[PDB]
Amino acid sequence: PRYLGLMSGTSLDGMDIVLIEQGDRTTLLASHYLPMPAGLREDILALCVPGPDEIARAAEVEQRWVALAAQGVRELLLQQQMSPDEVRAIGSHGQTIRHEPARHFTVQIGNPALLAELTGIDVVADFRRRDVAAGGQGAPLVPAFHQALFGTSRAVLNIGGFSNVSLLSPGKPVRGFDCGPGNVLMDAWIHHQRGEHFDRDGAWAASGQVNHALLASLLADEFFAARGPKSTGRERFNLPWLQEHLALPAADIQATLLELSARSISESLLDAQPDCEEVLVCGGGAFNTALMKRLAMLMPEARVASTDEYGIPPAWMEGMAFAWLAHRFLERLPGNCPDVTGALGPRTLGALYPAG
Amino acid sequence: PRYLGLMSGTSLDGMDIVLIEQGDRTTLLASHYLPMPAGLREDILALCVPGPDEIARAAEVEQRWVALAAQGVRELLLQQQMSPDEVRAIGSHGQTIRHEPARHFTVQIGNPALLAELTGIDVVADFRRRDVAAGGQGAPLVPAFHQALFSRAVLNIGGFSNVSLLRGFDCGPGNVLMDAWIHHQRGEHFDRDGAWAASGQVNHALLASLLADEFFAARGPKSTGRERFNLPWLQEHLARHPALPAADIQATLLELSARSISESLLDAQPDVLVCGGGAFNTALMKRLAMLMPEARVASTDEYGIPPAWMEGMAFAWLAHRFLERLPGNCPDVTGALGPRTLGALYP
Ligand SMILES: Nc1ncnc2c1ncn2[C@@H]1O[C@H](COP(=O)(O)OP(=O)(O)O)[C@@H](O)[C@H]1O
Ligand SMILES: Nc1ncnc2c1ncn2[C@@H]1O[C@H](COP(=O)(O)OP(=O)(O)O)[C@@H](O)[C@H]1O
Predict the structure, then answer these.
(1) A185 and A69, same structural domain?
(2) How many domains does chain B fold into?
(3) Where is ATP bound in this sequence (chain A)?
C-alpha cells in the first residue's frame, strides 16, 4: 500500500513529508518540505528545557505543529492528484521536546487525533514510547528500516542534529546507537554567532583551523566513552555545554566542532565494526561537503557515499522510515531492534488513531 | 468479548478496574478497587494547575499511575483465574490533569504504551482528544453508554455531576466542593453519608451567590473541571460575608449540588438513575428526591448495575466501540461536528 511519513527532527529546519509505496520493497513516490516558521521553531526549542506552564504551552505549540503538518499533507496529495483515501496511514514521528531514557521517558508532541481529524487519514504515532517501556532508549528507531533497505558489511549513517549509525554485519543482530553531535553544535554556534541557521557546505568551518586543545577537551565527554545502546539529544549537547568548555577565533571553534562530529562518528563506527566496507550517509549532514571529506579520510578502509548512490535521497530517509513503521504497526510486525535500543525484546511500536 | 475498564476520575479517591462481558449486552463480571496513595494523589493535584517542570513531573507521575494500574489489572485477573489473553483490550480513561475545551485541549496522562507493556493486553486510550479535535467539549463521554444500557435521566455524581437525558452535559459540582471543604477544614477526604452537611444549616445568602455563577446559566453542550469549581473559588465567595460555621458552609455546598442538578435536569427534560460515589451520599440523595418529586430518584443498583462501577464500565465499552469502529461520542452532548471513533490503540 501507500503510506505517508511525517518527520520533524531535532534540527528544526522544517517538516518532511514523504509518500512511499510499500509491498515487497519500499519506493519513494513523492516528497514535500515545509520550512519551520521562526515563531514555531523558537517555541519548540523553549519546550526543550524545563520551564513554566509546559502543559498548556505544549498543547498550543502542538496545535500549530499539526495544522502545519496537515497543510503539508493536503498540498502534497493535491499536487500528486491523489485523494486521502488512497493512503493507508500516516506514520508520524511527532516532535521531540524531551528525551530522558535514564528517567524512563521520552516526550513527542503532535496531537495524532487532531492530525487524523485534519487529514482524513489514519495516523500511527508515538513510536518511541513502547521501546522505552520495555527498558530501551527509544532511539535510534531507523535501524530496522535501514536493515530492510540495505541488509557485505555496511554502515548506514544518519547525520541530522545528532548522528546515529546502523551497523549491518551479515549473520548478526542489527546494531547501532547515536554517535553524538551531527549538525547540532555547528548549527548552535553559527546561530549564537552569525544569527544564521546552518553552515552551508561547511564553508565557514572550512575557513577555520581545528583547535586540538578544545577538540580533546570535547572528546573527553562521558558520552563518547560509552558503548552499546545509547541515545542523546538537546539535553546533553547544546550551546551552554560548549561555552562551559570554551571558558579563540569563531571560525576556529566551528572547524573544531566539525572535527568533533567527524571523529566521534569514525571512532564509534570503526570500534564497533572495523570490517566496515561501506558507509551510507543520510540526513542533512550528507550535504556538508566539508564534513563528508573528513569522514572519507578518517575511514579510509570504507567507501563514504550518500544514499543517493544507492537510490534514496539522503534528506528523506528518516521520513521514509516513519512511513515504513506505520506499515509495520499495521502488519503487527516489530519496529525496534532490541540490541540497538536495549529493550527486553522486539515490540510493536506506535499507536493507531483512525480517521474513522 | 471481555474488556477491562480502567477509571480514575477527578475526585482521586482511587483507581477503578472493571471486567465486562460484551456481546448483545454489557455484563459486569468483576470489579477491583485500588485506593490512591496519598503521595500520588497530591502530585496529581499539583499537576492540575499551571506550574514549573510539568513535562518531567507529569511523565514521572504517569509511570507511577500506570504501575499502579497494571498492578490492579494483574491482581484482578489472578483473583478471577483468567490470563491476560482472555481479555480483548483495556479501555483506559487515564488521568485528567488539564481540561480546557475553550482552548481546544484536554490532557489525560497515563502512558498507554507502558500499560500495554506491563499488562500484555491491548490498550485503548486517549478517548477525549478526537471529540475536542472535531470541536467538542470532550465530555461527558458516558452518554452513548448510558443510552445503550438504559423518559430517563442517568445522573453521574463524581467530583462533578453530569446527566444523560434519554442529550447531556455537566450540571456542575458533585462531590468536588464538599470534598474540598471537609479537607481544607477537617483534613478528611469526604463527608461520609453526608452526615457533616446534615448537621449544618443552609445559608441562603451564600447559596444564591454561588448559584449566580456564569456556568449555571449556560445551556446545551458544556463541561467543567477543577479549573472552575475549586476551594480558592469558594473562599472568594466566603470573603464577602463575615465568619460562618463550617458545617453550615458544608450544608450549603450539598444544596448547591442538589439544586444545580435538579434545575439543569428539569429545565432540559421536565417530563432519575444515580451513579458515581455521590449515590452513596444519602443526605444528597434525599435532597434530590425532594427537588424532583415528579420522578423516582434511585441508584443504578435497582436496575442491575453498581453505581460505583458505571464509569469504568463505560470505558471498557468504549474500547469495544473503538475495536468495532463504532462512534463513541454523542455530537449533541459534546457539540462536536459529528460522530467520531474515540481513542487510540496501543497493541
Ligand atoms: N547544503 C548544506 N550544507 C551544509 N549543511 C547542510 C546543508 N543542508 C542541510 N544541512 C544541515 O542538515 C541539517 C538538517 O538535516 P536533517 O536531516 O533534517 O536533521 P533533523 O532530522 O534532525 O532536523 C541542517 O540543520 C543543516 O545543519
Ligand atoms: N460513603 C460515602 N459517603 C459520602 N460520599 C461518598 C461516599 N463514597 C464515595 N463518596 C463520594 O464519591 C467520590 C468518588 O466517587 P467517584 O464516582 O469515583 O468520582 P470520580 O470520578 O471523580 O473519582 C468521593 O470523593 C466522595 O465524595
Answers:
(1) no
(2) 2
(3) 9-16
Given CB atoms, is B112 within the 8 Å cutoff of chain A? yes
B117 and B233 share one domain: no
Question: What does the block give as the cell for B215?
Answer: 456556568
Taking CB atoms and an 8 Å cutoff, what residues of chain A touch B54? 53-55
Which residue range forms the structural domain that includes residue B86? 1-138+309-347
- For residues B317 and B332, what is the distance between their CA atoms, to the nearest angstrom? 20
- Contacts of residues B186-191 at CB distance under 8 Å and 24 or more positions apart, as own/partner, are B186/B246, B189/B13, B190/B11, B190/B13, B190/B277, B191/B250, B191/B281
Helical H segments across chain A, by residue range: 38-47, 54-79, 112-119, 128-133, 143-150, 184-194, 203-206, 212-219, 222-225, 239-246, 250-272, 289-298, 317-330, 338-341
Provide the grid cell at B123.
490498550
Q: Which ligand is nearest to the CA of B142?
A: 2
Chain A interface, best mutation among B108, B130, B131, B132, by max A CB count within 10 A:
B130
Residue nearest to atom 19 of ligand 2 (CA): B158
Experimental method: X-ray
Backbone phi, then psi, for B301, in 5-degree steps? -60, -35
Identify residues after which chain A is interrupted (C–N over 2.5 A): 151, 247
Residue B225 in contact with residue B174, Cβ under 8 Å?
no
Does any CB of chain A come closer than 8 Å to the CB of residue B108? Answer: no
A295 and A192 in a common domain: yes
Q: Is the CB of A178 under 6 A from ligand 1?
A: no
Residues with Cβ within 8 Å of B52's Cβ and at least 6 positions away in sequence, in order, are A50, A51, A52
CB of residue B11 inside a 6 A radius of ligand 2 = yes
Q: Which residues, 6 or more positions from B314, have their beta carbon under 8 angstroms from its beta carbon?
A: B5, B7, B141, B142, B145, B146
In this structure, are B192 and B277 located in the same domain? yes
- Angle at B114 (CA atoms; ends B112, B120), nearest 5 degrees: 95
How many Cα atoms are found within 13 Å in the side-chain-facing hemisphere of B39?
Answer: 6
User: Residue A278 has which C-alpha cell?
Assistant: 561501506
Mutate to test the pocket of ligand 2, among B33, B161, B190 (most ligand atoms within 8 A of CB): B190
Look up residue A81 and give its three cell numbers.
492528484
Distance of residue A112 Cα from the nearest chain B Cα, in angstroms: 9
> Do A133 and A143 sit in the same domain of this protein?
no
The alpha carbon of residue A203 is apart from the nearest alpha carbon of chain B, in Å, by 38
Q: Whose CA is nearest to atom 10 of ligand 2?
A: B277
Residues 6+ away with beta carbon under 8 Å from A282:
A156, A157, A158, A159, A306, A307, A312, A314, A315, A317, A318
Rounded to whole angstroms, the Cα distance separating B196 from B250 reads 7
Question: In chain B, whose CA is at the least distance from the CA of A58?
Answer: B55
Residues 6+ apart with CB under 8 A from A196: A190
Q: Do A118 and A189 share a domain, yes or no?
A: no
Q: What is the largest CA-CA distance in chain A?
A: 59
CATH number at residue B347: 3.30.420.40
A240 Cα to chain B: minimum distance (Å): 19
Same domain, yes or no, for B24 and B158?
Answer: no
Q: Where are the alpha helices (DSSP H) in chain B?
A: 38-47, 54-79, 112-119, 128-133, 143-149, 176-186, 195-198, 204-211, 214-217, 231-238, 246-268, 282-291, 310-323, 331-334
Report whether the peptide linkage leading into residue A170 is cis, meaning its omega lies within 30 degrees of zero.
no
Out of A284, A299, A315, a domain closes at A315
Same domain, B317 and B288: no
> Which of A16, A14, A120, A352 lies closest to A5, judged by CA?
A16
